[PDB]
């Protein structure tokens, strides 16, 4: 069993809902890692222990270059610790903050890496349901890695009804609390592709009520600089009917993607 004494601790890397994520190093191997801390009292008050249970059992199962590794876990009197792969280049969120918008090459490359990661997830009947920029991390070579599986589920036989995720990235069936499946991640992929190119997600409004309505009615428009190929991909992903959204194979082979991705 791991314990805190197995690790050297460094600076906070980021801030989570239930605690910070810290730079860490395994003492024997000097291997650099991240330690995600969750305070037990806060978890218990919020009553979301099942999210942590799902996060651990699902993410420790996954082995893919574009999915953040979870190596192990432990706890003490007051805290739960998740031992994670360290992502040195930070979040896609921060990168978008600094660049305002991504060019088509960078965007298509990220979408390729996301589609590969999601293809692997969906083959194991895992749905992520929260793939927003602050949960997309960057490896040492700037490769995208999906992280934060606290909203994920293993759904091999039945559809889900949980109210989950983050409004701006959610499809109509999820915000309306209807039955949903792996196609929710395809909708979020469309939101991301738009946000990467434009700098803001497509259904952004000043009020949550208005954003909710815009999502439900698929109300968004394209700025003039978004190209024909990008419009085609995004419009196909942001379909109200989940079954009309493309397979991930279709995303990976889309002409705008293959023309622009460096991967």
């Amino acid at each position: 069993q791991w314990a805190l004494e197995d690790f050297e601790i460094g600076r906070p890397l980021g801030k989570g809902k239930f605690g910070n994520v810290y730079l860490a190093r395994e003492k024997q191997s000097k291997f650099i890692l991240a330690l995600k801390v969750l305070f037990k009292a806060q978890l218990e008050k919020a009553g979301v222990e099942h999210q942590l249970r799902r996060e651990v059992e699902i993410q420790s199962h996954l082995r893919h270059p574009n999915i953040l590794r979870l190596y192990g876990y432990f706890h003490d009197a007051t805290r739960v610790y998740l031992i994670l792969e360290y992502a040195p280049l930070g979040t896609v969120y921060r990168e978008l903050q600094k660049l305002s918008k991504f060019d088509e090459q960078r965007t298509a490359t990220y979408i390729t890496e996301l589609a590969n990661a999601l293809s692997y997830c969906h083959s194991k009947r895992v749905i992520h349901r929260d793939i927003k920029p602050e949960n997309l991390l960057l490896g040492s070579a700037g490769e995208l890695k999906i992280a934060d599986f606290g909203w994920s589920v293993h759904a091999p036989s039945s559809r889900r009804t949980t109210l989950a995720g983050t409004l701006d990235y959610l499809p109509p069936e999820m915000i309306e609390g209807r039955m949903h499946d792996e196609k929710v991640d395809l909708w979020s992929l469309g939101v991301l592709c738009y946000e990467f190119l434009v700098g803001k997600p497509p259904f952004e409004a000043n009020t949550y009520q208005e954003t909710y309505k815009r999502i439900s009615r698929v109300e968004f428009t394209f700025p003039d600089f978004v190209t024909e190929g990008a419009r085609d991909l995004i419009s196909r992903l942001l379909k109200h009917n989940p079954s009309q959204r493309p397979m991930l194979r279709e995303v990976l082979e889309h002409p705008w993607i293959t023309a622009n991705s460096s991967k």
């Binding site: 099942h50 293993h154 409004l167």
Partner: peptide
């Protein structure tokens, strides 16, 4: 991996967007 058991949705904290929508509803309709 086992199929993910559901939970008691109203026994715990909802996503923050739900809480914000409820506030908007209570604050100005």
């Amino acid at each position: 991996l086992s199929p993910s058991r559901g939970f008691a949705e109203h026994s715990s904290e909802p996503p923050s967007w739900v809480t914000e929508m409820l506030l908007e509803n209570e604050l100005w309709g």
